[PDB]
């Protein structure tokens, strides 16, 4: 059995059990964390990965926290460079736990870890079978398995190649779904995990998940001479998981949407594949297998499978007092989507759609008995979803009144009119396809390694380990 | 229904026949009411129709319908008389009967109290609901999408001996327009006519088999009639009634048809072209009707479970017209054989009931009220034999009994829109023209057998439908042991004490006045209060008969010497406080036409309009 | 008993039991795969074949992965060219499992499989009774039974002939039904197995099962110099089973729609037959027999039996902002088709048909026992299906309002006739379809030149894994 | 042959639209269709195709009609014989025939064949679209006896085709509960 930090009467328990049919999940709450759902999935994903790999295999770990792998009976090599504000705190915590447990546990051979950690502190350049201060493209340790957990700060084709030339034949990735960023959207949400993300230019909106505004009476205008007749997404995205803020980049996010088959070329040639094994309401787990040589041919296509509805529509808001328009995206539960099939056969106003959605969500009746406040989906996303269905129904009817002939395209004045699209809706059990690049040959090696430690910091760990 | 319906039509009459101008009871003689024979005239209609065209302000049209309806009544008599040639008979000398009269009742003065602003009345009623019924006042948060929610989930049923076509089971909602209510009581709308609702209504399983007409069945019936004739009837009329039968007579048909109204006569006339004879009309074939209104009681039960669907089993239209002339004679004979202290609500009015129980109920008196609705009459075949034995003793002619008996055996029902067939065994409740009479007879027989001689020595007993009240009777273990021969939940009994726990009878309260010192019956205010929170269908123009009914009911509530008693009676029954303010709120609503418009709102249309 | 990797609450268990009445099926779920239904059918198909094959007989396996044939107690001869992008992964997995259990059981000729695998690694051009690195044409092993499992990249008449001249008298084929591709459609679906396919020219559609588009506002026109004004099916076709992508070609797909009898004429002559033994909602199993000599005569017809409805209608959609029209095909459950018989007696609008279908898609339970399921068909195909029924009913009323004469076909000096519109084709359950194909083949061309496709680093890795025999 | 899932059709109507054994394709309608010949007559030919289940059998009309033997016939040659034909088993399309042959020459021949019907036989005219061109021919089928008995009263008057179809559907599909025995049966095929 596996214990998770989840309330015993939550609706997420059923979803977790369905996604992991090989375990036995039980709830045990010890802290009122604001991101409990996001941590339960990560805990189960790691356990599944360890179960399928055989023992006595060296495992790399890119950008990890050493304190998490202390009590594991596996070989780990933590690559921990010092390039984040949360790194010095993690190192101090690792040393404190290591010294406190010295002696009480004997089957986890932490005595070797303590002394070996002392060696790297004295000289911050030597290699070590458990710790290092290098990067992914600078470490020179040889292994066969690499693990990525919530990493969005590296370039996937470049990082993977440097691991393959060291005898690595397997890789894993855990993180958010990349599909919303391939549609070039402006804002979105992950309702099941209390996650909201927005672009840099819409941080002063009024009716989105992540925004803040003020009160105004209405003036003539600003002293603006620049025209600025463009509002397009840029390469700057802000994430918010619960109460924690994370800045990200668009180019590095889209680089992880790898195709099915692609080739790596250079000094040595490799061929590899990418597959998806676990998917639950936004979190996915990807497995990559690499082989030496060059076989087959590529096509450059990526396929995504939707187990629940995916929506993207155009909305009008007021940013800093001025009306603008942009696009948003969200997820919809499968049960709600199936129950709306009949009503979208007609033309419905947004008011009628909104009232119907509320009744289905809060006052559902089963077996002749009413269940109050089931709350299948969060209420703050209903207004935007209701408008999306209204536009979708209108567009379908216009297509039925413009019947054309079979296998022809009219040309008289030889230009063809393009129609307007305001809503993209993907039903459950429907696949989406995108075009990407599947041929990579160019790589760059920094070869500019330099330590990032400090004298006062090094003294702190030395004092802790010299008890 | 019984006393008065929502539109003030009721089942009782409005003519007093049990009133006297003396301070003592006087026995009198029952007489007959002469009926004007209809006559045919065509020349009058032709000239009146032409004179209708030249000038018709308001009364000229009315003469045309009166002439036209009168012609239809004469035609029906001529056609109906020819069909039943083998059963028609003549008038024999009648057996005289006598009845007792009572002095007129005395009432206390009434003072009217009302508010001014109609919006404040709604606020007071809404505040009353929230304080006493928290869950009921928070149910409504959106529109009425009950039909859609019933379609999303499937169909669950418990049938027996039924056939239907699965290809016609589809329940997509149709257009629905109504007015948004102002009172926050969540009274549901009538159901839609679909195959899903029909199967849900017929989810009753009464499959029980016993001895049909064998020796054990006859023995139980023989004992039942013995108890009825020994503890509830006198012996001065049985031998005379047996000698004189009751047969179909021209006077019975002439009197019956003349009492019908305009639209009813026209409907009957449309089914007289292919007139089948009396012996050709089947007596065990019924049709299924759904158009009803849901029944709701005070409390919080309709916000958690869906209510049931009501159905009507309609018999042949010609069957209920050939033999419906013998109901009056049966009522007269039944009243003649009953004891003076045993009463039946048939052939009475509201005023007559008050005069009978004027000086019988006093504070500190025990009253026993019992209903027999929760009883499966289809399990035992002796319940049908007992009714027939009583009918035979009353003097019903032999061939007519066979026609009546055919409707109390195996019957079948059919749903015309969907072609759904149903079969039922022995059934007591139906849509025939002997339903109240047989139920009243069985109710008296059950009470007489259980109570034995305690029914004879009593002050006042009233029986009607499935309800009864008996004065000066308490609950003991003897009646429990007697009634526990088969099971225990045959009947439900409740003990009541005057001025402490007010007795309940036919949706009303029996209270003892303080200024005058006499008993009286009033209606239930909470039942009315929940009824104003019912949505009104669009296109309905019946918002004037309800105001008059409310005005009459409000006046009876504000009589001096009954305000304090009404407060205690409601609290002891429903455990609710603060009903004087609600009554005052009802007073200002029923004061003018415009004041009644504050209970409605804007029109809402659902499932309609391709826009 | 046979165990399958599906959950106990699935509605697909009843279909599997009906198509396999000689087995006892129980569910046991250990993996949340997105293609559980497709994998379950293939597992049962192999078990049935093994019960019809005489033992102590060697079997060829074209394009096989030898990892799943390790525990079988038969004589398999895998043919594994190094042509696809998944082959190196399969070979490494096969070697790892062989060495990891070389002494635990040692009852399925484990030592022999290791010994001859090493021999092939030394000399590429070597024939062993268990493994080889040739193609279906260049192989030299002699057998009598051939098995094809999900093969769509070979020409059937050419491949079958090369097996026949080597002593093969029986063959099997497992795969998807090829009926939709004989109708020259643009897109289709197999709802029961969560499979969607589409042509490469309509990948930018809006309301099909495999597409993706963007949001636009509407501009007057595009300066596209290349003007085709034609929209016809092409060779390239894309498949999507679960979350996996497979490219296919139309020519090879259509070559497996074989007639009842056909002749293969070359240096030697053979007579062949083809029958269907298992069919379940899209998957079929075919048995082919060969015999030397020429007998009988051929007609050149193919017959397909429909146990459920089949639709192929015309729809209008916007591809990359431009409005066009093409054809779409799908499958319909039999129960839905039966209950629509009375409604389609008159003319009905698409709006009304959609409402009727939704109502018929609800459960019916009587006395605690179910009679109709809650979801007979998936909801993402209802809009297109309801449109097809509307046009079909319209075309039937017009036919019966214009009567011709018996035995006379009117063609009106010059005489000419008129063709009528046909926007939908509906094949009701319990109805056969007949097509015209080719039955005589005499050409068998081959490259006649084999080249190795194994690299040195791969050879060293395989040898290193097998070096550690304990 | 609805009870055995057997459909047969002539070789000239294999491109029909609404019969058991046919197949067609989508089109848009054309006016300028011209042909080399001007054939104006449509008679059945000698070639017929059978389909039992999923198996195809070519057949000939002359050979099929040669087995409809009389009750008494004479075989005259070097040796003369008298023969007889009887039907002993019949079930919705399949029959079992027994022939007795004796040497000599006796009796007199008549030349008639008799068939007894137990279910019901129909043959009518239908209008379809063959290769995009509208023509008319004749079809035949078998009907159960229970359906035929329950239609006696309706066909007394004139009925429209749409009214008849709705009545047939209601009579075909039914569910009977009757306590603890549910059926959910279909009397005849819906196509
Ligand atoms: N966009 C983004 N999300 C992250 C990143 N790192 C972690 N997350 C996610 O944020 C969620 C919040 O969980 P955390 O409390 O941060 O996990 P933790 O490492 O145990 O605790 P911390 O020290 O706060 O990071 C995690 O489950 C991650 O899935 C990141 O770098 N970028
Ligand atoms: N169109 C097509 N479908 C295939 C092919 N190979 C397999 N399939 C189908 O895809 C389904 C899933 O394949 P798997 O059983 O998972 O094969 P695997 O050995 O586990 O590894 P993968 O092929 O990478 O999934 C199979 O059941 C087949 O029905 C192919 O080559 N072409
Ligand atoms: N090669 C690498 N490059 C950058 N970061 C790495 C690398 N390897 C490991 N990491 C770890 O990635 C983590 C993220 O650090 P990052 O450079 O992205 O700064 P951040 O802005 O605080 O995080 P983020 O951009 O994800 O919001 C660091 O803790 C770092 O130790
Ligand atoms: N004669 C052959 N030609 C091609 N492939 C063969 C042949 N014989 C066996 N195979 C097997 O078929 C597979 C090759 O399939 P293919 O080259 O078409 O891969 P692909 O490019 O992904 O396209 P597809 O979707 O059709 O599989 C290999 O596993 C191979 O072992
Ligand atoms: Zn390192
Ligand atoms: Zn070989």
From Swiss-Prot, chain D:
Palmitoylated by host palmitoyltransferases ZDHHC2 and ZDHHC19. Palmitoylation is increased by the interacton with host STING1. It is a lipid-anchor. It comes from the Viruses. It is found in: Host cytoplasmic vesicle membrane; Host cell membrane; Host cell projection, Host filopodium. Cytoplasmic capping enzyme that catalyzes two virus-specific reactions: methyltransferase and guanylyltransferase. mRNA-capping is necessary since all viral RNAs are synthesized in the cytoplasm, and host capping enzymes are restricted to the nucleus. The enzymatic reaction involves a covalent link between 7-methyl-GMP and nsP1, whereas eukaryotic capping enzymes form a covalent complex only with GMP. The N-terminus binds a zinc ion which stabilizes this region. The C-terminus is disordered. Homododecamer. The enzyme forms a membrane-associated dodecameric ring with a central channel for the exchange of between the viral replication factories and the host cytoplasm. Interacts with non-structural protein 3. Interacts with RNA-directed RNA polymerase nsP4. Interacts with protease nsP2. Interacts with itself. Interacts with host STING1; this interaction results in inhibition of cGAS-STING signaling and increased levels of palmitoylation and protein stabilization of nsP1. Interacts with host TMEM45B; this interaction leads to viral replication inhibition. This is mRNA-capping enzyme nsP1. It comes from Chikungunya virus (strain S27-African prototype). The chain holds residues 192 to 382 of 2474 of the full protein.
């Amino acid at each position: 059995p596996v214990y998770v930090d989840i309330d015993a009467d939550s609706a997420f328990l059923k979803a977790l059990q369905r996604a992991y049919p090989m375990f036995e999940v039980e709830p045990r709450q010890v802290t009122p964390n604001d991101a409990a759902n996001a941590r339960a999935f990560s805990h189960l994903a790691i356990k599944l990965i360890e179960q399928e790999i055989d023992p006595d295999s060296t495992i790399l770990d890119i950008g990890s926290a050493p304190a998490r792998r202390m009590m594991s009976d596996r070989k780990y090599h933590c690559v921990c460079p010092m390039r984040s504000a949360e790194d010095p705190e993690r190192l101090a915590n690792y040393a404190r736990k290591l010294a406190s447990a010295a002696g009480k546990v004997l089957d986890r051979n932490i005595s070797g870890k303590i002394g070996d950690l002392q060696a790297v502190m004295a000289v911050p350049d030597t290699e070590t079978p458990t710790f290092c201060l290098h990067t992914d493209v600078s470490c020179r340790q040889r292994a066969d398995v690499a693990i990525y957990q919530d990493v969005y700060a590296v370039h996937a084709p470049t990082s993977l190649y440097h691991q393959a030339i060291k005898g690595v034949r397997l890789a894993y990735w855990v993180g958010f779904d990349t599909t919303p960023f391939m549609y070039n959207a402006m804002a979105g949400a992950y309702p099941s995990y209390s996650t909201n993300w927005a672009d840099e230019q819409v941080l002063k909106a009024k009716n989105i998940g992540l925004c803040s505004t003020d009160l105004t009476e209405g003036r003539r205008g600003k002293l603006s001479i620049m025209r600025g007749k463009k509002l397009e997404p840029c390469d700057r995205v802000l994430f918010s998981v619960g109460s924690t803020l994370y800045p990200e980049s668009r180019k590095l996010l889209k680089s992880w949407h790898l195709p099915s088959v692609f080739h790596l070329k250079g000094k040595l040639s490799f061929t590899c594949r990418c597959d998806t094994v676990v998917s639950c309401e936004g979190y996915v787990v990807k497995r990559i297998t690499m082989s030496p040589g060059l076989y087959g041919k590529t096509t450059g296509y990526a396929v995504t499978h939707h187990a629940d509805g995916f929506l993207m529509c155009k909305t009008t808001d007021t940013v800093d007092g001025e009306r603008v328009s942009f696009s948003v995206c969200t997820y919809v539960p499968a049960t709600i989507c199936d129950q709306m099939t009949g009503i979208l056969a007609t033309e419905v106003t947004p008011e009628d759609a909104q009232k119907l959605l509320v009744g289905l969500n809060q006052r559902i009746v089963v077996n002749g008995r009413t269940q109050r406040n089931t709350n299948t989906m969060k209420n703050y996303m209903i207004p935007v979803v209701a408008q999306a269905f209204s536009k979708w129904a209108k567009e379908c009817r216009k297509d039925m009144e413009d019947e054309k002939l079979l296998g022809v395209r009219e040309r008289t004045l030889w230009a063809f009119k393009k129609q307007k699209t305001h809503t993209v809706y993907k039903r459950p059990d429907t696949q989406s396809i995108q075009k990407v690049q599947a041929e990579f040959d160019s790589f760059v090696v920094p070869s500019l390694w330099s330590s990032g430690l400090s004298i006062p910091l090094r003294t702190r760990i030395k004092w802790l380990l010299s008890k | 229904y019984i006393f008065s319906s929502d539109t003030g039509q009721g089942h009782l009459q409005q003519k007093s026949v049990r009133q006297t101008t003396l301070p003592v009871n006087i026995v009198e003689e029952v007489h007959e009411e002469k009926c004007y024979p209809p006559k045919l005239d065509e020349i009058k209609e032709q000239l009146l129709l032409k004179r209708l065209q030249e000038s018709a302000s308001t009364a000229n049209r009315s003469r045309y319908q009166s002439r036209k309806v009168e012609n239809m009544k004469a035609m029906i008599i001529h056609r109906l008389k020819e069909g039943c040639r083998l059963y028609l008979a003549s008038d024999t000398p009648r057996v005289p009967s006598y009845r007792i009269t009572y002095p007129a009742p005395i009432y206390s003065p009434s003072i009217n109290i009302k508010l001014s602003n109609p919006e404040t009345a709604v606020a007071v009623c809404n505040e009353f609901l929230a304080r006493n019924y928290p869950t009921v006042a928070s149910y409504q948060v959106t529109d009425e999408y009950d039909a859609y929610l019933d379609m999303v989930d499937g169909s669950e049923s418990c049938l027996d001996r039924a056939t239907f076509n699965p290809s016609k089971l589809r329940s997509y909602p149709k257009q629905h327009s109504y007015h948004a209510p102002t009172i926050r009581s969540a009274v549901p709308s009538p159901f839609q006519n679909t195959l899903q609702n029909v199967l849900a209504a017929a989810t009753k399983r009464n499959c029980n088999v016993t001895q049909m007409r064998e020796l054990p069945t006859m023995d139980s019936a023989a004992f039942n009639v013995e108890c009825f004739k020994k503890y509830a009837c006198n012996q001065e009329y049985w031998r005379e009634f047996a000698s004189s039968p009751i047969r179909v007579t021209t006077e019975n048909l002439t009197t019956y048809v003349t009492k019908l109204k305009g639209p009813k006569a026209a409907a009957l006339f449309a089914k007289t072209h292919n007139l089948l004879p009396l012996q050709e009309v089947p007596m065990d074939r019924f049709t299924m009707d759904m158009k009803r209104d849901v029944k709701v009681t005070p409390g919080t039960k309709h916000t958690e479970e869906r209510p049931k669907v009501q159905v009507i089993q309609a018999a042949e239209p010609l069957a209920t017209a050939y033999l419906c002339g013998i109901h009056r004679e049966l009522v007269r004979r039944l009243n003649a054989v009953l004891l003076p202290n045993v009463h039946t609500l048939f052939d009475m009015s509201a005023e007559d009931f008050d005069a009978i129980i004027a000086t019988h109920f006093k504070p500190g008196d025990a009253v026993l009220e019992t209903d027999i609705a929760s009883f499966d009459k289809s399990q035992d075949d002796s319940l049908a034999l007992t009714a027939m034995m009583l009918l035979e003793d009353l003097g019903v002619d032999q061939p007519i009994l066979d026609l009546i008996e055919a409707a109390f055996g195996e019957i079948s029902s059919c749903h015309l829109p969907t072609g759904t067939r149903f079969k039922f065994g022995a059934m007591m409740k139906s849509g025939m023209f002997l339903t109240l009479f047989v139920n009243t007879l069985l109710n008296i027989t059950i009470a007489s057998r259980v109570l034995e001689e305690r029914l004879t020595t009593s002050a006042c007993a009233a029986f009607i439908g499935d309800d009864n009240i008996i004065h000066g009777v308490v609950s003991d273990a003897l009646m429990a042991a007697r009634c526990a021969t088969w099971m225990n939940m045959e009947v439900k009994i409740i003990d009541a004490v005057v001025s402490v726990k007010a007795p309940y009878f036919c949706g009303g309260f029996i209270l003892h006045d303080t200024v005058t010192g006499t008993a009286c019956r009033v209606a239930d205010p909470l039942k009315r209060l929940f009824k104003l929170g019912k949505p009104l269908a669009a296109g309905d123009e019946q918002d004037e008969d309800r105001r008059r009914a409310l005005a009459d009911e409000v006046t009876r509530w504000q009589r001096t010497g009954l305000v304090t008693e009404l407060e205690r009676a409601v609290y002891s029954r429903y455990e609710v406080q603060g009903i004087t303010a609600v009554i005052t709120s009802m007073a200002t609503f029923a004061s003018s036409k415009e004041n009644f418009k504050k209970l409605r709102g804007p029109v809402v249309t659902l499932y309609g309009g391709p826009k």
